[PDB]
Design a protein around this ligand. Structure first.
Ligand SMILES: Nc1nc2c(ncn2[C@@H]2O[C@H](COP(=O)(O)OP(=O)(O)O)[C@@H](O)[C@H]2O)c(=O)[nH]1
Ligand SMILES: Nc1nc2c(ncn2[C@@H]2O[C@H](COP(=O)(O)OP(=O)(O)O)[C@@H](O)[C@H]2O)c(=O)[nH]1
Lengths: 168, 168
């Protein structure tokens, strides 16, 4: 309705890291243990205050199954921010971060803000990716970093708040 | 990208009529009693080889929640087809059809192909909307008509095939 800006932010990362739940957690405060992730591409909006300004954060997610030219273009088109997500309890998903970074470099707009997100922090008892290793990688590649839990909500609001503030 | 044509078809109608399940049926022949409907807007693609050609039917669905210019325009933009859905066991969802037809009128392309769909035909013992009446309304408005059951699959693939044939 009435707002100041509209920013599109896309979620990327291995399937199963919790992208659909970061989306639902942030935009509707909903979480599902048994995934209700999109079968294709999905986006939902959340209005949030940033520096007094009302921003409509339109968050995108995908199963990544469909990759024909048209859909891949539509996904990144206009995106001013990207949350590159991995699962702190699954090292493989972090090992794939390098590839997702290249993906963004090959399809995203040049001015896109990227933030590395280690999701499922509530599973720290089974941690597979040391916070320090991920943070160091984040710094060396010039991008913000934070660990979240869509499950218990820790840092979810902060994560989007941060990337949105970096874009504005 | 190796198809011949890309047709965008949108699903509209009251929430709870079964749109997310028509989408899951059309794309993966799957049905969920426990709704996995999108929380905002989502689209998935179904590939079908017809006339030696290969067509990608990009089906869109909506939660109907988010309602702000930007997204409303993007929803109908480029759509060559529309499935206007109601629940045959809930008379109110049928009453709203006329109002849904109005939204297509001033938001969708004038030449968009519209098919009226009476879903949940498996709940015949709870029917609230007589078939002949719905069909008469469709007839008078120049709309195709069919009753489906995303739950037991009846006429779902046929409804899809019908509108695509009308669009192609
Ligand atoms: N423990 C835990 N599970 C999570 C978290 N976020 C998502 N999940 C779960 O992990 C699975 C995969 O999540 P899904 O959201 O479908 O992620 P996607 O495939 O990346 O989009 C589901 O079982 C979720 O309930 C989280 O922060 N903590
Ligand atoms: N009996 C019956 N239930 C259905 C049918 N299609 C969908 N449903 C159910 O009715 C509810 C509403 O469906 P949902 O797909 O989320 O429709 P939406 O809100 O229009 O997008 C869900 O519990 C579905 O499982 C159908 O053909 N028959």
């Amino acid at each position: 309705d009435e707002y100041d800006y509209l920013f599109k932010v896309v979620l990327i990362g291995d399937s199963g890291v919790g992208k659909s739940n970061l989306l639902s957690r942030f935009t509707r405060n909903e979480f599902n243990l048994e995934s209700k992730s999109t079968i294709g591409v999905e986006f939902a909006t959340r209005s949030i205050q940033v520096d007094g300004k009302t921003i409509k954060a339109q968050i995108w997610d995908t199963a990544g199954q469909e990759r024909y030219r048209a859909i891949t273009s539509a996904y990144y088109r206009g995106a001013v921010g990207a949350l590159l997500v991995y699962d702190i309890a699954k090292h493989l998903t972090y090992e794939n971060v390098e590839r997702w970074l290249k993906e963004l470099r090959d399809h995203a707009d040049s001015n896109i803000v990227i933030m590395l997100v280690g999701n499922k922090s509530d599973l720290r008892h089974l941690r597979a990716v040391p916070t320090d290793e991920a943070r160091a990688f984040a710094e060396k590649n010039g991008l913000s970093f934070i660990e979240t839990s869509a499950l218990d909500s820790t840092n979810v609001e902060a994560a989007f708040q941060t990337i949105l503030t970096e874009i504005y």
